[PDB]
């Protein structure tokens, strides 16, 4: 029944994947309100669709900055994957378009802010609070991996809490459709799997190690490997020595010792039972997977929203006038966008 759902999901994905949606809006169809977030070659702005009065999060990428950072393929994969994906725990891409200067990805506005914001402020989540989110990530990856997609950027910053209190995974810049092994060094230092650092080839198992880093962070209030500088973080990851806070249940410690597993022949998600080694684990015993998927499970925290256009759950960022050059920039590089 899960493999039945996933087979339907695949058919739906592959059609949108082999025939991507292009130019589904124009910049003048949207009223730019506030910067919700920031990235190296763009920003996510709170936007208002005038025809509908609907609120969206529009990701604006500078084509030249994408080209400069050799992020062409990454930007193309992200739009292609997002326009083809459909899962409850993934931000819905409503529109996508491009102009002379920028690439645009109009997404569903997730008003509750990032898990990062709430996790930092609250300190740590209770094991049931982290389990609830972990479960949503578990199914999300189960979904992405069935479509042969690697996420590669899981962290609290990328997971947005929606009005119902459910996660919505954003930032698809490192998402790649791979049937086999990949070698690109990408992701966030704290979440990198040893294979990525060791510059060896890697697969989906890196998303399971990331899930491990996320569950620890959510439960501890700090990542399992931190140091003031990235190369110092990498030394702790490759070492494969994790201390667990004294409050961690034996189940959590066991789940994490399997997810944060340097040995791929032993790493949960990377074995014969695949995802079921995670799903059935003692720490997830109380989890009803179908109920999580259907959003029928009670959220441990429902965000504060003071209207459809509210941005209070998001931090303030400096704004920059969106200038659209009179000449088409990097046109051929982004022709399929």
């Amino acid at each position: 029944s899960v493999k039945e759902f996933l087979a339907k999901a695949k058919e739906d994905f592959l059609k949108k994947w082999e025939n991507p949606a292009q130019n589904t809006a124009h910049l003048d169809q949207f009223e730019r309100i506030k910067t919700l977030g920031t990235g190296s070659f763009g920003r996510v702005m709170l936007v208002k669709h005038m025809e509908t009065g609907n609120h969206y999060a529009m990701k604006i990428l500078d084509k030249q900055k994408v080209v400069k950072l050799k992020q062409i393929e990454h930007t193309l994969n992200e739009k292609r994957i997002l326009q083809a994906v459909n899962f409850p725990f993934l931000v819905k891409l409503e529109f996508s378009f491009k102009d002379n200067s920028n690439l645009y990805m109009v997404m569903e506005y997730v008003p509750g802010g990032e898990m990062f914001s709430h996790l930092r402020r609250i300190g740590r989540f209770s094991e049931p609070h982290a389990r609830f989110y972990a479960a949503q990530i578990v199914l999300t990856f189960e979904y992405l991996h069935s479509l042969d997609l690697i996420y590669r950027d899981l962290k609290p910053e990328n997971l947005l809490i929606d009005q119902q209190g459910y996660i919505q995974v954003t930032d698809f810049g490192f998402a790649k459709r791979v049937k086999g092994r990949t070698w690109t060094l990408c992701g966030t230092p704290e979440y990198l799997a040893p294979e990525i650092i060791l510059s060896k080839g890697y697969n989906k198992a890196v998303d399971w190690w990331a899930l491990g880093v996320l569950i620890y962070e959510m439960a501890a209030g700090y990542p399992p490997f931190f140091a003031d500088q990235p190369i110092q973080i990498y030394e702790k990851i490759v070492s494969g020595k994790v201390r667990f806070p004294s409050h961690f249940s034996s189940d959590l410690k066991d789940l994490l010792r399997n997810l944060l597993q340097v040995d791929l022949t032993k790493r949960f998600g990377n074995l014969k039972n695949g995802v079921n080694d995670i799903k059935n684990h003692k720490w997830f015993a109380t989890t009803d997977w179908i109920a999580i998927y259907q959003r029928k499970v009670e959220a441990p925290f429902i965000p504060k929203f003071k209207g459809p256009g509210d941005t209070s759950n998001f931090d303030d960022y400096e704004e920059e006038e969106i200038r659209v050059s009179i000449n088409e920039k990097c046109g051929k590089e982004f022709s399929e966008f």
Binding site: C186, G187, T188, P189, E190, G221, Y222
Partner: peptide, 18 residues
């Protein structure tokens, strides 16, 4: 504590991709 070390660290802010 491990928490104090994290709090005092330079990596308690929004982390960037590499």
């Amino acid at each position: 504590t491990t928490y104090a070390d994290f709090i005092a660290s330079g990596r308690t802010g929004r982390r960037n991709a590499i």
